[model samples]
Target: MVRGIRGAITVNSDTPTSIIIATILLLEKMLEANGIQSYEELAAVIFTVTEDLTSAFPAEAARQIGMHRVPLLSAREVPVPGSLPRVIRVLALWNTDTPQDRVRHVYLSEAVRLRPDLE
Candidate 1:
């Protein structure tokens, strides 16, 4: 069966470089932890960023992490008036036999607060 994993990180700064680096780091860790050993198992990845993060597209970071042939999509998150800034979010779809509870969802940097139950 197919399973989906979600991961995210908050950019320390609103720069293109920071966004790219953080996105790559966050995705790399999440994919590896969940046993997504190769690009072939990755069906698709969708990334979304808060309104404050316009410096770069998060997909560029995936490319840096060797996601050459996988499909990637990026979009802007809904601006909820006053909300978190410089946040990059990802949803990764992959073919896996693992149960949902076994999936490892990562939330790094300031995003860790979003999943305090994990800690």
Candidate 2:
């Protein structure tokens, strides 16, 4: 089976370190919770940041975590009428036997409010 995990976080400031730290935190939490122990099981990762965030590429965070071989991409989220600012979102695909319903999506900081139903 194939499953995907979603995670998002908002940086306190638009600094490079802050964005990198938040991305690392969110990704680690998602992978840890879902028992993603190795990079081989990972298919790819996609990251999107709000327009306000421009300090650094979110994909850099994944490289810092030694995900050099993992296919990673970064893009900007659509500027909707109403949307969170300075938010970084990630979707990680993994080849797993877990069911889709069992997948856990994480939202941290101000992004938590975006998923109140799960909270």
Candidate 3:
């Protein structure tokens, strides 16, 4: 069965460099937390960024991490009033037998506040 894992992180600034770095950090943590062993296990990944973040696309970080063949997409989150700024969120679908209850979701940096229950 396939399982979906989620993660989110915030960048300190809206610079392209910051977005790339923050995305890499978040993806690494998500992979580690979920014990994702290979890129082949990833079916697809979708990234959503808050309106405040426009310097770069989060999918670049995935390619940097060697997920060149995995399907990746980026989109802007609905600009809800008072939502977190400069936030990048990822939803990854993994082709794994792991039960959904065992899947771990990662939240880092200021984005931790977005999902306090997970933290």
Q: Please report the candidate that would top TM-score against the real structure.
A: 3
For residues 1-119, write the lDDT of model 2, one tens digit per residue.
67878898998789999999999999999988887788998899999999889989989999999999999999999999777888999999889899887888899999988884654
lDDT of each: 0.88, 0.90, 0.89
> For candidate 1, what is the lDDT?
0.88
Better of 1 and 3 by TM-score: 3
Clashes of each: 0, 0, 0
Return the lDDT, model 2, position 117.
63
Question: Which segments of candidate 3 are over 4 A away from where they belong?
Answer: 116-119
Query: Could you tell me how far off, in angstroms, the CA of residue 25 lies in candidate 1 after the best superposition?
Result: 0.7
Scored against the true structure, residue 90 in model 1 reaches a CA lDDT of 91
Worst 10 residues of 3 by lDDT: 110-119
Steric clash pairs (candidate 3): none
Looking at model 1, report the run of 10 residues with the lowest lDDT sum. 110-119
Q: What's the C-alpha lDDT at position 88 in model 2?
A: 97
TM-score of each: 0.92, 0.93, 0.95
**Residue pairs in clash, model 2:** none
lDDT of 3 by residue, 1-119 (tens): 88999999988889988999999988999998877778898899999998888888899988998999999998989998987888899999999889888889999888878884744
Candidate 3 whole-model C-alpha lDDT, 0 to 1: 0.89
Ranking by lDDT: 2, 3, 1
lDDT of 1 by residue, 1-119 (tens): 88988997998788989999999889989978876677898889999999888879999988987888999999989898767667899999988899988899999998887784665
